[PDB]
């Protein structure tokens, strides 16, 4: 148990990655190739002394991973297990940005990609960009936004991994800053056991702007997934998360694993699991134990 494990994904051929690697980087150093049948994953798992990990081993290999361009896990421990994970829904859950393609749709991606604009420079709030860009939407035929969200796409990788997740003991949410609509109709479609986000009501089927407060911006998504594994009794070093942008570090910092998706700059610098080059059927390496 003074003992650590770092699984290693790549798609160079692994003799070739484990020799690199070794003279790259020099006590035992256990090397195992394996093959995760369940993913269709062929995967190098090195064990080496737990004194190894520190912050400076860290930023090295994950310096050197995004140089030769490998994914790479270090075994939680204890494992997380029977417990939650949620995922953001935009460029998380799914590929795209659900209010965006909404204003794509509608010829608008100009004024709603300038609200960004101000919100991003810091010139203005995020609640407020949330709220300006949904006014622009007013109107919209709940239709549309069916439409909108039946073109979105899964993440890579969800669609094998997710009956997994089940199948492991776990609840799956999404937690989002996003639509309800979208919500829970990804919820639905995808049998996830819990789904949150902002509320903005439709009606006499057109998008109102009757927005439910207070709005769920970051703070609250962490508060969000803290009520939820109360209710559940789930302990902290249970609950997975995975995200990709600034709004999702508390709720990723907060989670025991945290998990940052192809993600934005400063989220791969405070979150360092990391999924950067392959598809969610690598959540398998921080949920089952026999790899
Ligand atoms: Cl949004
Ligand atoms: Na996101």
């Not at 190739?33 to 400076?56: D, G, H, M, W």
């Not at 035929?141 to 969200?149: I, R, S």
Request: charged share 20%; aromatic share 10%.
């Amino acid at each position: 148990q003074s003992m650590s494990i770092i699984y290693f994904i790549t798609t160079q051929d692994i003799d070739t990655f484990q020799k690199k690697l070794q003279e790259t980087l020099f006590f035992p150093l256990l090397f195992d190739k394996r093959y995760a049948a369940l993913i269709n994953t062929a995967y190098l798992k090195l064990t080496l002394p737990a004194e190894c990990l520190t912050p400076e081993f860290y930023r090295y290999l994950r310096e050197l991973s995004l140089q030769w361009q490998f994914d790479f896990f270090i075994k939680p421990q204890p494992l997380p297990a029977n417990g939650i994970i949620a995922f953001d829904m935009d460029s998380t859950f799914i590929a795209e940005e659900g209010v965006d393609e909404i204003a794509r749709e509608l010829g608008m991606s100009t004024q709603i990609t300038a609200i960004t604009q101000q919100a991003m420079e810091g010139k203005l709030d995020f609640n407020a960009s949330f709220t300006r860009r949904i006014g622009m939407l007013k109107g919209t035929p709940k239709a549309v936004l069916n439409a909108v969200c039946d073109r979105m796409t899964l993440s890579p990788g969800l669609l094998t991994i997710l009956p997994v997740i089940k199948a492991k003991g776990f609840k799956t949410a999404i937690i989002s800053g996003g639509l309800d609509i979208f919500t829970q109709r990804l919820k639905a479609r995808y049998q996830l056991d819990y789904a949150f986000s902002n509320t903005v009501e439709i009606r006499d089927n057109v998008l109102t702007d009757n927005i439910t407060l207070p709005i769920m911006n970051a703070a609250n998504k962490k508060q969000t997934l803290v009520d939820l594994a109360a209710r559940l009794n789930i302990a902290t070093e249970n609950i997975i998360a995975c995200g990709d942008g600034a709004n999702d570090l508390p709720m990723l910092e907060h989670a025991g694993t945290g998990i940052a998706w192809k993600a934005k700059p400063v989220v791969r610098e405070k979150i360092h699991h990391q999924i950067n080059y392959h598809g969610f059927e690598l959540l398998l390496f921080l949920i089952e134990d026999e790899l």
